[PDB]
């Protein structure tokens, strides 16, 4: 069970022993940004709760040269020796420290090692990044990213989030660099040869994955929150101007969170820094949050309204973590939604509260619809499941841990109301401050809202409704997928019935009965009727139940405003009824009810519970619809049918769609200005509508956009393009070897990585194979087009008909190289796989992908995303074979 030199490596489990608890780490790191390596040492104060001959902790890719143990309490180890024998077992990323004399329960010891490695080459542990300056200089910084399991690549440590400790960090550096870390800098002291050495205030108790340090030459803007925290935004010096909005938003959010959670942020400073090469979107390292440049930086001339909205989100997301994750931390990675689900959910409360004009409230339903796909497949997973190897732990970061977790919290908040929800939250955070919780600690704390309360008879429903709350959500976390609520209206008697919603699996399928087996949700229902817009609430705990309506009514609309994580079906006239209402007077349904009805109709076609012609019937009212969320939801289905047709050659149906979209909706498309004027939905509407018109080669749209591009190129950036149409204008621009060349050159020179983002997109809507592969080759290189951007580039290329095949060929014929740059469980490889295959909709393509996935399990590689893809290409094939002629005739009928 053992190896390396020989010898029995004394520990066997992948998890660490719990006999040696860490308490304080003295960490000294000395990096050199010229030799691109580092030297380092640590002293770890541990407490032993059991007698042991050995200590076990993590360490990967680090060379260890000293190993001593000390104690002020165990004379045998009194200063300075002894020396420990060090035993390495890479397969478990562990090392063993072999103590000469079995240690003593309840006494403290001091472990000490010296370690060194090259600066990392990826996006892991202590790695190298580079940026360009305004003068075309290329500089180097060194930066940490640890989540989940890579602190162990920087320093040996008890590397599991339970082993919270205090950290005391010192860093050696040249005068041209600063050094940053979790905590403020107490001391710089100067040294012999002229080097400096920063001391940082000891951390509070905290998990290893959040420890951070950076050595760079960046610049900042600072400001102070209402409660005295110094917020600073760091970016490379030529981008200082782009940090203003981040400074403004962090202050108001950190304010908001202190008041909302009723718990001060504990450190004196909060730094946000924008790292040029950064794989995740951001990481919530306590006191030193790192960001993708596009998550943090903003610049009014090239960053759109959508951009701002994204930057605010990510900032609100990371600050939320300072309490959810850093303050209170998962016991282990199985319950990782405990922090990502909550940070995600809190983007909504905090951004709604601090920036209501961003209208983020209306964008939150998209987070939940986006996860209802995926979750309507059998390859889904529950929100908490066991996970033990590092890849599986990385795999826990997906739309389920984040989106779905945030969505069911929203459900529960709507049930208990905001006050009891906030109160529950505050108690969760206050109670596990500086330690760890699991699922059940949350549910207990969310249910519970001389003596504290007054005694009553009504008290029994306060102790029993509380127990209901806990019983409820354990079904939402331990069960994969989402419930279909099927309503039958006949009389003033409504029959209720829950199934597991399945897509590409119809009510009468040979595989349907098994997949439906043991599933049952405590679904907190809501609804309203045509009579009174008054919400009623009932809790369907059983596979069957019924309700009497206090009147007769035209229609019943379940799932008010879509606060609930379920789809609704109406048997009988229900669908005919509600659609009629939408056709005649649509404003007698609340806007979010509309968004939901549109959503659910199209989702139910997929499930075979409804014919496509009935969905397509509902979209007719969109000619009258001015609520942008519902109008854009609606359009999005028509726009995806088109691209799906376009992706096959099915050009008779595609051309009909193009005509129905430009004809119907011709008025709304035509009110659109090529400007940045109006509200945020106003501008979300404008970019959408114009993008659609130039995708469908509308002659006005293509000509306006093409003009702006010449005006722009022939002034070499002088006259300027309103942000909301920037991406359109550039991509129409890219349709010639001239524009595309110019744009590629503008990419290298630009200093808005949000502009770069729009340019590289535009560049991928070209039709020449040569251009698309060039984009990819560059992407591999990592010089022109950074490798952090490759996965999204392949995705953009594959999305479009001319690039479908190329992206596929490339992913297969270059798989080995792809993996040298990213971990198998990285969001990069997940997206590279998925983005190049999941839109495929034919028996042929399904075959090839089945083969390419098989081969990857010849070699040592398994991911869930394999089944999920195949289940999505299958879902697609059925959709076409079971709905396509209905779409063909509904258009033809319509042309008539």
């Amino acid at each position: 069970p053992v190896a390396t030199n020989g010898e029995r490596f004394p520990w066997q489990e992948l998890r660490l022993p719990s006999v040696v608890i860490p308490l304080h780490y003295d960490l000294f790191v000395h990096p050199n940004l010229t030799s691109l390596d580092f030297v380092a040492s640590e002293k770890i104060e541990v407490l032993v709760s059991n007698a042991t001959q050995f200590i076990i902790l993590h360490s990967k890719d680090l060379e260890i040269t000293n190993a001593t143990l000390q104690s002020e309490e165990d004379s045998r180890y009194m200063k300075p020796g002894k020396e420990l024998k060090v035993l390495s077992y890479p397969a478990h990323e562990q090392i063993a420290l072999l103590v000469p004399e079995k240690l003593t329960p309840h006494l403290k010891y001091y472990v000490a090692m010296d370690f060194q490695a090259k600066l990392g080459d990826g996006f892991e542990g202590f790695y190298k990044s580079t940026y360009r300056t305004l003068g075309g200089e290329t500089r180097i910084l060194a930066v940490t990213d640890f989540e989940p399991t890579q602190a162990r690549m920087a320093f040996p440590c008890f590397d599991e989030p339970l082993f919270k400790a205090n950290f005391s960090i010192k860093i050696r550096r040249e005068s041209r660099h600063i050094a940053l870390s979790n905590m403020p800098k107490v001391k710089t002291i100067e040294l012999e040869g002229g080097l400096l050495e920063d001391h940082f205030e000891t951390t509070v108790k905290m998990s290893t994955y959040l420890v951070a340090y950076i050595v760079c030459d960046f610049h900042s803007l600072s400001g102070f929150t209402s409660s005295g925290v110094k917020v600073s935004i760091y970016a490379s010096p030529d981008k200082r101007n782009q940090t203003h909005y981040a400074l403004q938003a962090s202050l108001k959010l950190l304010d908001f969170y202190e008041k909302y959670f009723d718990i001060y942020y504990p450190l004196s400073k909060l730094d946000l820094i924008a790292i040029p090469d950064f794989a995740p979107g951001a990481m919530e390292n306590w006191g030193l949050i790192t960001y993708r440049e596009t998550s943090l930086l903003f610049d009014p001339k090239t960053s759109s309204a959508s951009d701002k909205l994204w930057v605010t989100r990510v900032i609100a997301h990371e600050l939320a973590h300072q309490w959810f994750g850093n303050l209170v931390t998962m016991e282990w990675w199985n319950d990782i939604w405990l922090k990502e689900g909550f940070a995600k959910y809190m983007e909504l409360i905090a951004v709604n509260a601090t920036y209501p004009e961003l209208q983020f409230d209306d964008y939150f339903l998209n987070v939940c619809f986006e996860v209802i796909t995926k979750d309507s497949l059998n390859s889904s997973r529950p929100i908490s499941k066991p996970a033990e190897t590092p890849t599986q732990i990385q795999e826990m970061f997906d739309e389920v841990s984040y989106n779905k977790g945030a969505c069911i919290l929203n459900m529960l908040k709507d049930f208990l109301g905001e006050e009891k929800f906030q109160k529950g939250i505050i108690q969760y955070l206050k109670k596990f401050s500086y330690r760890n919780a699991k699922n059940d600690d949350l549910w207990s704390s969310l249910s519970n809202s001389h003596s504290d309360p007054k005694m009553t008879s009504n008290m029994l429903a306060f102790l029993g409704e509380n127990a209901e709350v806990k019983e409820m959500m354990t079904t939402w976390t331990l069960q994969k997928g989402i419930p279909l609520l099927v309503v039958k209206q006949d009389g003033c008697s409504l029959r209720l019935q829950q199934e597991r919603f399945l897509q590409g699996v119809f009510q009468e399928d040979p595989e349907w009965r098994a997949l439906q087996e043991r599933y049952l949700w405590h679904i907190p229902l809501t609804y309203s009727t045509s009579s009174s817009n008054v919400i009623h609430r009932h809790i369907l705990k059983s596979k069957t139940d019924t309700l009497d309506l206090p009147e007769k009514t035209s229609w019943v609309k379940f799932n008010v405003d879509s606060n609930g994580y379920y789809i609704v079906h109406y048997e009988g006239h229900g669908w005919d009824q509600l659609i009629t209402q939408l056709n005649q007077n649509h404003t007698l349904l609340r806007p979010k009810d509309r968004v939901g009805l549109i959503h659910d109709v199209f989702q139910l076609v997929g499930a075979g519970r409804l014919t496509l012609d009935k969905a397509l019937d509902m979209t007719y009212y969109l000619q009258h619809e001015t609520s942008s969320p519902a109008l854009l939801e609606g359009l999005s289905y028509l726009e995806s049918f088109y691209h799906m047709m376009d992706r096959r050659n099915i050009s008779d149906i595609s051309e009909n769609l193009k005509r129905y979209l430009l004809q119907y909706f011709k008025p709304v498309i035509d009110r659109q200005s090529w400007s940045d004027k109006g509200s945020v939905w106003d501008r979300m509407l404008r970019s959408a509508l114009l993008k659609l018109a130039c995708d469908l080669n509308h002659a006005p749209c293509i000509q306006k956009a093409a003009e702006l591009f010449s005006q722009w190129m022939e002034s070499s950036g002088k006259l300027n393009i309103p942000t909301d149409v920037l991406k359109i204008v550039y991509s129409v621009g890219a349709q010639t070897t001239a524009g595309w060349n110019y744009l590629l050159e503008q990419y290298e020179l630009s200093m808005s990585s949000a502009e770069q983002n729009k340019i590289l997109y535009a560049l991928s809507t070209s039709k020449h194979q040569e251009k698309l592969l060039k984009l990819i080759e560059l992407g591999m290189e990592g010089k022109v087009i950074k490798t952090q951007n490759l996965a999204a580039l392949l995705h953009a290329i594959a999305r479009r008909p001319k690039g479908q095949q190329l992206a596929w060929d490339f992913v297969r014929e270059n798989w080995t190289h792809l993996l040298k740059k990213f971990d198998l469980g990285s969001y990069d490889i997940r997206m590279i796989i998925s983005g190049t295959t999941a839109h495929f909709s034919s028996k042929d393509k399904l075959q090839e992908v089945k083969l390419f996935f098989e081969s990857l399990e010849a070699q040592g590689s398994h991911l869930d995303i394999f089944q999920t893809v195949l289940e999505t290409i299958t879902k697609n094939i059925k959709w076409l074979e079971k709905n396509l002629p209905t779409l063909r005739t509904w258009l033809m009928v319509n042309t008539r």
Partner: peptide, 6 residues
């Protein structure tokens, strides 16, 4: 967390 990119 993230995670993602956009």
């Amino acid at each position: 967390g993230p995670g993602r990119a956009f």
